[PDB]
Amino acid sequence: MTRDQNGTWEMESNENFEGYMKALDIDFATRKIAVRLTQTKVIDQDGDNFKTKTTSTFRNYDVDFTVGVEFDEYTKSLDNRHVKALVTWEGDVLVCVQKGEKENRGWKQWIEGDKLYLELTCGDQVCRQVFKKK
Ligand SMILES: CCCCC/C=C\C/C=C\C/C=C\C/C=C\CCCC(=O)OC[C@@H](O)CO
């Protein structure tokens, strides 16, 4: 029983964020800034209802969802695309499929020990982030 992801989480590693952003067609100048940054993630979770806020000195991104309920997601200030998003549980892993113009786009987020893991996929690029609880 490790579905409770509530907390404030600080990034400690961010593997292949450059490749993930390139797969999303983020321009070089934006990648140059974004790859430098430590992200913070605040998760407010009530059962299957999630409110998430990911922050940095350069851009912030909020996404709220209920597990099992498809929603329209606009990735404002990231790659600025519209997708249909669905988050489901696979065991205690949150799995999101973002259906839209990019093939094989989604993410998976789970608790393991005292860490939050987030793997973001776009095409053949996977970015693996690890966060430690504040
Ligand atoms: C927002 C801080 C990073 C900004 C970097 C600025 C520009 C880079 C442009 C595009 C890169 C694409 C995505 C950024 C990566 C992670 C932010 C969270 C994405 C997400 O939905 O979290 C999954 C899940 O945690 C949400 O609940």
Residue numbers in the entry: 0 to 133
The study reports:
Present in the small intestine, cellular retinol binding protein 2 (CRBP2) plays an important role in the uptake, transport, and metabolism of dietary retinoids. All CRBPs share the same protein structure architecture. These small soluble proteins fold into a single β-barrel that shields the central hydrophobic cavity that constitutes a solitary binding site for retinoids. Access to the binding pocket is governed by a “portal region” composed of conformationally flexible loops connecting neighboring β-strands. By examining chemical libraries of bioactive lipids, we provided evidence for the selective interaction of CRBP2 with a subset of nonretinoid ligands with the highest affinity for sn-1 and sn-2 MAGs that contain polyunsaturated C18-C20 acyl chains.
In fact, as discussed later in this report, only 1-AG (S-isomer) binds to CRBP2. Indeed, the crystal structure of CRBP2 in the complex with 1-AG clearly indicates that despite geometrical differences between 2-AG and its sn-1 and sn-3 isomers, the binding modes for both molecules are identical. Inside the binding cavity, the arachidonoyl chains of 1-AG and 2-AG adapted the same orientations enforced by hydrophobic and van Der Waals interactions with the side chains of the enclosed portal region of the protein. Also, the position of the oxygen atoms of the ester bonds were nearly overlapping (root-mean-square deviation of atomic positions, 0.3 Å), as they were locked in place by hydrogen bonds between the carboxyl oxygen and an ordered water molecule (W1) as well as the potential interaction of the ester oxygen with the ζ amino group of K40. Similarly, the nonesterified hydroxyl groups of both ligands were engaged in the same network of hydrogen bonds that involved the side chains of K40, T51, and Q108. Thus, the identical contact points between these ligands and the protein observed for 1-AG and 2-AG could be achieved only by adapting an alternative orientation of the glycerol backbones in the binding pocket (root-mean-square deviation value for the glycerol carbon atoms = 1.3 Å). The only consequence of this difference is the 1 Å shift of the sn-3 hydroxyl group toward the location normally occupied by an ordered water (W2) in the 2-AG/CRBP2 complex. Importantly, the binding of MAGs by CRBP2 is restricted to sn-1 and sn-2 isomers.
